[PDB]
Structure formats: C-alpha cells, structure tokens
Design an enzyme around this catalytic site. Structure first.
Site, PDB file in Angstrom:
ATOM      1  CD  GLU A 209      -3.143  -1.343  -0.560  1.00  0.00           C
ATOM      2  OE1 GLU A 209      -2.883   0.403  -0.946  1.00  0.00           O
ATOM      3  OE2 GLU A 209      -3.040  -2.166  -0.955  1.00  0.00           O
ATOM      4  CG  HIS A 212      -1.083   1.021  -4.788  1.00  0.00           C
ATOM      5  ND1 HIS A 212      -0.797   0.927  -5.508  1.00  0.00           N
ATOM      6  CD2 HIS A 212      -1.185  -0.133  -4.102  1.00  0.00           C
ATOM      7  CE1 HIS A 212      -1.335  -0.427  -6.016  1.00  0.00           C
ATOM      8  NE2 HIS A 212      -1.683  -1.109  -5.132  1.00  0.00           N
TER       9      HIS A 212
HETATM   10 ZN   LIG Z   1      -1.950  -2.922  -5.122  1.00  0.00          ZN
END
Ligand SMILES: [Zn+2]
Ligand code: NI
Lengths: 398, 7
Positions: A209, A212
C-alpha cells in the site's frame, strides 16, 4: 522511525496526539502523529467516504477469503491500542530495511503540490490535503499531511489507498499528488500456498500500500483504465498496470513497454508543468510558510534543478532516477527480498484463507524477523509463517 | 489493493 511508543489512552496534546476532522469537505476522531507528515487513525473508515458508515455485511456480500465483515472490529479502546501498536511495529519493520527506509523517506518528501489557486501566480494549498486538528479552545487549525493509516471500512480485509479528488484536477495522475489514506489492518492476514498453509507477512501487505501511496503522492499513478487482460492460465479477468508495477518482479513481463514509455514521457511533462508553475508564482496564501520555503519543498520533492536566478527546471537524469525509484525499485517483490519471507511470486493469484493475528507481543512477531523468530522453533523453513506449525499465532476465519 | 479484492 516512529517518535514515540504511543498508547491509545495517552492524553491529547493538540500536537502529535489530537482529535481531528477529515475533509468532506463528522465528530472528531483521536489520531496519532507517528512521524512528520504521517498520522494514524485507529478507527474503522466511515469518513473518507461518508456513505460507507454501515459496517454490517451488505446484501449479497462475498465471503472469506474474498471479504470479511464484523461491525464490531476496532470498536474498543483495547483493540484501538493494539491497532496503533501493530501499525507502529510494521513501520519499524519496513524502516529497518534499506529499501523501506528509502520508500518512507520518499513518502515524507512527497508533499502534495500546492495547486489550490485559481490565479496562476499564486501558490495555495489544496484543503483536502490537510486535516483539521482541534485546539484547547475547541477551534481547529489546518495541518498538511502526506499519509494517513486508517482502519478498514465495512470489508475488513479490503486494504487500499484512497484520497480526496479535485473538481477538475487528477491529483494522483498529474504529478501533483494528494494526501493518501491507506485502509489497512495489522490484525488480519492472508494465506497462500507453496489450502493457504502459509501466511503473508503483514509488513509486505503494508509496504504494498505504501508503494501505491508513493505513486499517488508524486502524482504518477497509472490510470486504472490501463489494464492487462490476464492470460496466464484458465476468461474475463483484468489487472491494472498500476498493480502489476507495484508488484514488480515476475509481473513486469505483462507491462506493455510501449505504453510505459508513454507514461514516462507524460509524467516528465507533468513535472515540467510544475516547475513552470513554481516559476510563475508571485504570491502565496497562508501565514506559516514562505513562497521561497514552499518552492524549496517542491524542488526537493521533484528533484528539480535550480539556477542562479531561482528558476526551476527538470533534470532528465534526475527525473529518470526518481521515476525509476518510485516505479521499479519500490516493489512488493523487492520488499520480499529485503524481508527474506515467504510470499506470492506473482500478483496474479487469489488468496485461499484469512487469519486473525496479533503481532503486538514481542513473542509473536518482531521488527527484525516478523513471525520467523530467531532462536525459536519458528526460525527455520518459514515455520513462523506456517499456519499449522505456528498454531498459536493464526486463527483461520470462517 | 490485492488481486483477490477484484472478486
Ligand atoms: Zn495494490
Ligand atoms: Ni511467467
């Protein structure tokens, strides 16, 4: 990495422990500032999307290991304390690796661009990249931040990055970036094979995450409309290039090189537009930072080159380096290498099981070893990640 | 987000 060993019950101080409100655009929620630009909110996310306030399973819900619902999770102080300590621990585990130290540094540097003004000579913050921190007198002060870790919404295991959008700008794809809210829980993890006998180290999951988040904070996320139609085996399924890139490793095979060249050029130009904006600026709104301070903040963020007359420009080599760092170096697969844990070797597999865990106790999980505790029966053969052998640490969900 | 989430 994390300044203090916060307990949930620690008294508010309006600085790094405080009741806050999130843009939209809610009652105040207790939040903890674990690092410059980074906050943790130990609450189920019923906030970044006001409609999603019901935490009950909806009609037609999926089941484990796809989804998991429990309206009661993360409702009590004790579980909120555990959540906070769990997330803290994962940051330290990530930070303890050279790679994660670098990613976290990139994230802290990744201040969302001040593109809030309608006048093109005025720099201004975008309000949705801030939180409101309550003061002793009940008033609020606006604080800019990069990253929030928040508990999941209804589907407890739907981890993801979300951020507030602009009326017209695409903040996560125009090089500007935006404050990222990562829905995540350290209290669960997923089983894979190689039945779902082995458990994913939650540190890899968080790092995924964070990767991202890195993309989104630098405004270089790949539009989700760019997808690869999955043909590894077996009809229909697609995967976004953004996800393939985040995983990296083997899955780089599926990213269209011609397209990646398009993206790279596109974002280079976006960074160029940012340089130009800094150059046009004649005024700045706000009482805290100077125009020259903010300019410097974005010089550092985008690695701009600054001339004698304070003019900014993008360096081709430096852009290539940063872009590569964010998209090719920071990958889930590379994190697996640094952690030396067992993990899926492709993004393109479905989880087979979900487990309840508790990584807060030192005897269960450590910054340096995760579940695979040195000097225990769990040290070798990824025994720690073996859900049958490490029975005390995993409870498979129904 | 993990792939399984797409289901
Ligand atoms: Zn992902
Ligand atoms: Ni292959």
């Amino acid at each position: 990495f994390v300044n203090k060993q916060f307990n949930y019950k620690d008294p508010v101080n309006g600085v790094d422990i405080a009741y806050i409100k999130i843009p939209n655009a809610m009652q105040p929620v207790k939040a903890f500032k674990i690092h410059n630009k980074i906050w943790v909110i130990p609450e189920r996310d019923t906030f970044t999307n006001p409609e999603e306030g019901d935490l009950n399973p909806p009609p037609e819900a999926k089941q484990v290991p796809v989804s998991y619902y429990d309206s009661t999770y993360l409702s009590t102080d004790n579980e909120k304390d555990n959540y906070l300590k769990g997330v803290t621990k994962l940051f330290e585990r990530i930070y303890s690796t050279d790679l994660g130290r670098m990613l976290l540094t990139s994230i802290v540097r990744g201040i969302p661009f001040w593109g809030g003004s309608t006048i093109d000579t005025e720099l201004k913050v975008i309000d949705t990249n801030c939180i409101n921190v309550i003061q002793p007198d009940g008033s609020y002060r606006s604080e800019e931040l990069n990253l929030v870790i928040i508990g999941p919404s209804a589907d407890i295991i739907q981890f993801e990055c979300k951020s507030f959008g602009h009326e017209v700008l695409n903040l996560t794809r125009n090089g500007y970036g935006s404050t990222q809210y990562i829905r995540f829980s350290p209290d669960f993890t997923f089983g894979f094979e190689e039945a779902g006998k082995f458990a994913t180290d939650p540190a890899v999951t968080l790092a995924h995450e964070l990767i991202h988040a890195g993309h989104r904070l630098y405004g270089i996320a790949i539009n989700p409309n760019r997808v690869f139609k999955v043909n590894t085996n077996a009809s229909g399924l697609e995967v976004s290039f953004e996800e393939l890139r985040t995983f990296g490793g083997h899955d780089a095979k599926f990213i269209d090189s011609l397209q990646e060249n398009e993206f790279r050029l596109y974002y280079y130009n976006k960074f160029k537009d940012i340089a130009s904006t800094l150059n046009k600026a004649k005024s700045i709104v706000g009482t805290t930072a100077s125009l020259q301070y903010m300019k410097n903040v974005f010089k550092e963020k985008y690695l701009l080159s600054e001339d004698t007359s304070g003019k900014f420009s993008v360096d081709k080599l430096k852009f290539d380096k940063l872009y590569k760092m964010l998209t090719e170096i920071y990958t889930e697969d590379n994190f697996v290498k640094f952690f030396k844990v067992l993990n899926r070797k492709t993004y393109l597999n479905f989880d087979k099981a979900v487990f309840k865990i508790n990584i807060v106790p030192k005897v269960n999980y450590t910054i340096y070893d995760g579940f695979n505790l040195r000097n225990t029966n769990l040290a070798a053969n990824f025994n720690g990640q073996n859900t049958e052998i490490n029975n005390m640490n995993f409870t498979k969900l129904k | 987000x993990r792939w399984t989430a797409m289901l």
